[PDB]
Design a protein around this ligand. Sequence first.
Ligand SMILES: Cc1cc2nc3c(=O)[nH]c(=O)nc-3n(C[C@H](O)[C@H](O)[C@H](O)COP(=O)(O)OP(=O)(O)OC[C@H]3O[C@@H](n4cnc5c(N)ncnc54)[C@H](O)[C@@H]3O)c2cc1C
Ligand SMILES: Cc1cc2nc3c(=O)[nH]c(=O)nc-3n(C[C@H](O)[C@H](O)[C@H](O)COP(=O)(O)OP(=O)(O)OC[C@H]3O[C@@H](n4cnc5c(N)ncnc54)[C@H](O)[C@@H]3O)c2cc1C
Ligand SMILES: Cc1cc2nc3c(=O)[nH]c(=O)nc-3n(C[C@H](O)[C@H](O)[C@H](O)COP(=O)(O)OP(=O)(O)OC[C@H]3O[C@@H](n4cnc5c(N)ncnc54)[C@H](O)[C@@H]3O)c2cc1C
Ligand SMILES: Cc1cc2nc3c(=O)[nH]c(=O)nc-3n(C[C@H](O)[C@H](O)[C@H](O)COP(=O)(O)OP(=O)(O)OC[C@H]3O[C@@H](n4cnc5c(N)ncnc54)[C@H](O)[C@@H]3O)c2cc1C
Lengths: 370, 369, 370, 369
Amino acid sequence: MRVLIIGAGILGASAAYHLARLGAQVEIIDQNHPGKATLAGAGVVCPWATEADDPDWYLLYARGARYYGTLIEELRGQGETELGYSRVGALVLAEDRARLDTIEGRISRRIKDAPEAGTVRRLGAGEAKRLFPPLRDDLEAIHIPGGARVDGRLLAASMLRVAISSGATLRNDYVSLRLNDGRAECLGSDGRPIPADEIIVTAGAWAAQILALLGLRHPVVPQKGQIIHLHLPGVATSGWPVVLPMNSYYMLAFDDSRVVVGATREDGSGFDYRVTARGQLEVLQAGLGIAPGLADATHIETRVGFRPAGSAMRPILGRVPQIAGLTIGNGLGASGLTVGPFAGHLLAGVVMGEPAEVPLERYSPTGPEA
Amino acid sequence: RVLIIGAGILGASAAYHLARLGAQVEIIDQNHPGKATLAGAGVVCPWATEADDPDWYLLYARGARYYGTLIEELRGQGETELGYSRVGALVLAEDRARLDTIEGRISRRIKDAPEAGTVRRLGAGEAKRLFPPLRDDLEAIHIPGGARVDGRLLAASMLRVAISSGATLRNDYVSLRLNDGRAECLGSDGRPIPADEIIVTAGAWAAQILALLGLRHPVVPQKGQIIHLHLPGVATSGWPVVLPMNSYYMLAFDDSRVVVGATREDGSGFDYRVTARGQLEVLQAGLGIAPGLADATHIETRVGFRPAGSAMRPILGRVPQIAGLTIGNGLGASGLTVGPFAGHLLAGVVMGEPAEVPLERYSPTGPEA
Amino acid sequence: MRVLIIGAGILGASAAYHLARLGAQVEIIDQNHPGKATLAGAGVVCPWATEADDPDWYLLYARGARYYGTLIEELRGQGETELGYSRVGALVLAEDRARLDTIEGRISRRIKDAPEAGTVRRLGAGEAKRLFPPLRDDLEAIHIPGGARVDGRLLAASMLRVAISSGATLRNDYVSLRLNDGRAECLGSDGRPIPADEIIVTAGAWAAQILALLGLRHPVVPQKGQIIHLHLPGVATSGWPVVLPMNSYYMLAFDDSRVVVGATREDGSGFDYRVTARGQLEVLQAGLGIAPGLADATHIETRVGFRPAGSAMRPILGRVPQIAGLTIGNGLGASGLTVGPFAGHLLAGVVMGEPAEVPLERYSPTGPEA
Amino acid sequence: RVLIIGAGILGASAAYHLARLGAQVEIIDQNHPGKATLAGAGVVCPWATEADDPDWYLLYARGARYYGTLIEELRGQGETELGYSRVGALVLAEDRARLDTIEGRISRRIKDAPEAGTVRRLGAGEAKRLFPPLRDDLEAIHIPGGARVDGRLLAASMLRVAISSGATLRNDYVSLRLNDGRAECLGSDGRPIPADEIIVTAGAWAAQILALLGLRHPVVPQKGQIIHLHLPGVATSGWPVVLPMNSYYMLAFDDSRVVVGATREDGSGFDYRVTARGQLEVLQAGLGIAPGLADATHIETRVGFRPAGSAMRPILGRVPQIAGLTIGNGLGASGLTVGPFAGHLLAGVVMGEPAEVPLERYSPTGPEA
Ligand SMILES: Cc1cc2nc3c(=O)[nH]c(=O)nc-3n(C[C@H](O)[C@H](O)[C@H](O)COP(=O)(O)OP(=O)(O)OC[C@H]3O[C@@H](n4cnc5c(N)ncnc54)[C@H](O)[C@@H]3O)c2cc1C
Ligand SMILES: Cc1cc2nc3c(=O)[nH]c(=O)nc-3n(C[C@H](O)[C@H](O)[C@H](O)COP(=O)(O)OP(=O)(O)OC[C@H]3O[C@@H](n4cnc5c(N)ncnc54)[C@H](O)[C@@H]3O)c2cc1C
Ligand SMILES: Cc1cc2nc3c(=O)[nH]c(=O)nc-3n(C[C@H](O)[C@H](O)[C@H](O)COP(=O)(O)OP(=O)(O)OC[C@H]3O[C@@H](n4cnc5c(N)ncnc54)[C@H](O)[C@@H]3O)c2cc1C
Ligand SMILES: Cc1cc2nc3c(=O)[nH]c(=O)nc-3n(C[C@H](O)[C@H](O)[C@H](O)COP(=O)(O)OP(=O)(O)OC[C@H]3O[C@@H](n4cnc5c(N)ncnc54)[C@H](O)[C@@H]3O)c2cc1C
């Protein structure tokens, strides 16, 4: 009766994974809405290049990317060997040499507190193409040996599998909320309450819909994103790194001759689960523009997902003011696969009472407006 | 003016009927996974049902006859593709003993229903002559007048007519609170949604927001999986509905397509998944009476959550002790037949007309303590 | 113009994989017809329990199962580490103890000269359910620790990747054949011949269509097969064994909470690439019959594949009599994922002239029928 | 009597005409991946075509106005679902200059072709009023006679009429053999297929089986990728066809569906794959002139291999020096407009009727020593 988690994406799954290790009874409930963000998550893990230069770097991006090393092994030693993860390195690009210099600097300043990045290095024209053949030969780049990739769906799935293997439960259902005597109550499909000492709301983009039932104003709305998957027949891509043109687009490669190209950021889209023409056109232009070698690659599918985009680019983590037994994790935006796993460790310490490894006040949620 | 929460077959009909009368209708629909109206098979044949509840049957048979008014009212408005057709129905039974008791039930309920046509008990092989895939050793009772419809296309057409008449439709999950004895609607952001009259046709999900008002809404979801088949290059526009009276059924549509009866999974919750045993049961039932479907293409299997109430009879009418709030739900497994006519009844409530049928026996319950 | 391979299934891919490593210039052509057998192969590798006792066929079946040990590491050391292979053991079931005793006899006789099978051990009721939870608790079984499984598509894909990394070429095209001056010619899309010293036809079920152009009578026709893929949300299956109920059906599990169930065997089906109703019913009955735990598992997809089923259960491998520069490999039927990989190694030696590890006279095709 | 190899729009048209003349028809089709007729967009508008070749345009114009006869003969036969509609056509251009030259070329060719109607030059967004997604700043030339059709449904309709008239259809990959000067057809089993006359409408794959007779058939596949869009809740049955005169195009069907011009990939072979650049080219060309399609749903991308010949002129007529063999191929990118009438000619060849059109300029070559 310890913990009840609403939503089992990368964030809700990481919370369960970390809670099950603390001996708590974890009950997970996940509807798996069409457009579940984690099912469409590209899988880039490389914070050192992010242009968002706030103290969130020291707290979430840096700390989160440093934990991937430990997490992958902790999972590997538990029977979970299919995560799609690989420390393949990353290539960062820019249109003009001027902007490419300020980015190299921003990365250099951020290697001190994250040695997993390796030895950052400046590549000349044609050298990035030797690591990612589809790239243009006239592209200079910055190589970050530490940058990795992952299959967002498989990572969350494996974390859930480890939790359920050790006394956790998972079912497919849609639950709601009610405010009882100042405490948070979870109402099942029938309508009866679901006994739980602590509740965690990691409902992603849909969180604002059930939290509003408690008088809360959750400032997280869906940001639609369309992401293209390509197939290179008979092409060994297991060693290819990730590519970050620093223009809201990106692309990476997986072992099964597969290449994924950066997604769109459609604001005010709502929950529009449709593959549109312009959306795919945007991605195809940005992709083939830097990597003409992908021209004759097969188009296998185009996934759609709704990012939990918060008002601020920083997430919303911590216990709810004025409401007992309610914690929420959301707002991961476009960096959820990188921050999600560690953010889940934070929520684990919150509901249990462990000492805060970081100051969550910068991310604490808002209370009832009344 | 009017705010409708939930745009299934029921919420859509209410908007359709109200918009035509000039009321400012604002529709908000979340489109939950498993929206019942999207998964509805579309059989309309109440005279054979084995459930004997007059309060419920009164609307079942009445809503069936209403299709005569609806199809034409929609036809004369640009809407001609609703999948509706008066193709007739075949009622089957395994042992001739049960078939006799059923032939009795049908005649007893046809007393006030000439729309059912002239019933006739068919000899072995006569049912297969109208539905070839059936096995030849099946006696049946033919009800010329039983029809089918594409519930998905019916709700879509009624919404289009409502929007063309000044209604609005947007996607959101809204809630309710008690302000001054009246029902006030809050959007996801939390801002209020001004409305003189609110209607709640949220299907199985209705018991999640009404509970915020102290109401005990006895409607929970009953999952149901339904299989769609395709006979490549086979004319099916004339095939009848088939009701083996064993919780299963099957019907046909124009596009060489055959739909097979659904499951009934109590205590499923909103488990939007296509399970194995669910499809095994449907395929065993279908292929058991219709072995001709063996080599038919399986194109998709849909899932839906029926708004199953504590009692089989629905819940319609204003909420006692709460002003400006009306509820419609509980349709269960007959919402496509009862839905359209019920929306007409919900419209009359918020508009104030005298009830074409006394709604007292369907009214909801007030706030509890 | 060293070698031209027609068809890139598991067999054509294995041949290419072996030839390219020996310096031969390999040109691979594969249309990827709908129903490609390799893309729908279940992936069971456990020959010792087979009811079919054909020495000509069994020689390659048990031989091709042992070759998997070499292949997995060979591919592993080349960057191909995600092949879905695992030595998870197998469970052999039967309804009545009478036939289960007969099966135990066949296995023992064939497990004595096969240490790869491990220590065969007869389990009591409920012990097979301890390894495959969804099974019935009343089932006796025979445990073969050596039984393994693999993802057929990922295996053939990785082989091609290693082959093309070794100077081979892969193209999507439909080619034909004509007989010119007693030697085999391959007609490209334009209709003009394609220069090639040696041709290998691994066209699977479609092989007879183009080989008939040379006066041959290739007795390999398609046998449709429908196979169901299930999903157990939040269930660790990496350690689940294979199940062989010895009733033409079967089922296995993969790492990502996925369970596959035995396939149909539709003779005279032609190239009917449809998912039928009865085909799925039969599989569901067999699966849930012995494994009620799969009842509430998700059904994610149902694949279709045309097995290259030959008149004789033994395959067809070797040069074509009276026709120079032609080599045929086909007839793998329902055991190609086990035989395919090693059978490709045989085809490689044939076309190059190396001595045959196994006398191939018993598998040679027939010559032109004047 | 007659044996047809390949059941695309060309082989189907041939079967539809032969069955009416009382010939015993046996049709065999392998339905290769990328069958051109299954991916054909279906624009019918020869008057605007830029390719001014009289040897090829003789049939293009002649075959286009044959659609009038064909639709009615099919409409008066139970076949009413052809996707055909005389919706008109809009011809656009980059600059007013090129648009002027096109208007002149169009009017010259309608003298003895009144099916085009009254051509009118639009300007300043008048074209957008008939095709909303277009840009407002586009002048155009309206050709009321331009129509569209679903090549997939048309070929099926002809076949059904042919089968209702004693024709047979089978699935197999057949070959050809020289048996004492006669053309003989061998099935997959190797046994011969008795046929008094053989017609080869094998499309791009023809060169492969004809090489078996020592013939050199200069028809190779030209891959083309085509995109289908869906406009949620938008009536498009009345929208005309659009011909930007830039190697691309787009048309609209009844079911809120819009199709965009195809790619032209030479030397592609039978590469049955949907590529990235191919879709980028079509999306750019489509949205470049029709920004309104930005938020349209992408439902499908089809691939087909055009029977592109060395010369744009097709290949029709008996094979020299080989007895009982006839060839039809080379339809290229205009097969849906020329195909139907071309099948009528192939029927006239094998039966012996006089040539309505000069066959000398299309006949194939004989064996090369
Ligand atoms: C196209 C795309 C590409 C991306 N690429 C990257 C990348 O390269 N790197 C990176 O770091 N991040 C990336 N992201 C961001 C990342 O995928 C997300 O930020 C993150 O996965 C969000 O996970 P979540 O669990 O918070 O949300 P979700 O994954 O949406 O989880 C919410 C879950 O809760 C369920 N739920 C909701 N309401 C209820 C309810 N009432 N009852 C029950 N269940 C409920 C939903 O059905 C869902 O399963 C990408 C995102 C997109 C869309
Ligand atoms: C498999 C199956 C087969 C069936 N076959 C038949 C048949 O043959 N004949 C027959 O007569 N009936 C049949 N039915 C029954 C019929 O389909 C349903 O009873 C009917 O569709 C109920 O409609 P509804 O509008 O009440 O519910 P729904 O269709 O579920 O509509 C509810 C809507 O409200 C929305 N909503 C919910 N909560 C909120 C909120 N808080 N805010 C905003 N929107 C919200 C939901 O997203 C949804 O769109 C079948 C049902 C199933 C499942
Ligand atoms: C449902 C199912 C389950 C199975 N389960 C198992 C199992 O558990 N264990 C096991 O050992 N085996 C199993 N098998 C058998 C195995 O999948 C097959 O035997 C094997 O994949 C055959 O490989 P292939 O290369 O001979 O044929 P294919 O994989 O079909 O390869 C033929 C290829 O050649 C191409 N081609 C053909 N003609 C031409 C042409 N003219 N021009 C160009 N390309 C051409 C085709 O497009 C295709 O790509 C199963 C098979 C099925 C159908
Ligand atoms: C993407 C695309 C868009 C197009 N758009 C248009 C348009 O808007 N307007 C227009 O006028 N034209 C258009 N065309 C052109 C038109 O579709 C084609 O020219 C025409 O359909 C060719 O038909 P066909 O019957 O000659 O060949 P196909 O349609 O390719 O038919 C050939 C048939 O023969 C069979 N076959 C071949 N060899 C054998 C064998 N040995 N044994 C048995 N069967 C065999 C094949 O399997 C196939 O079924 C388009 C073409 C493409 C590819």
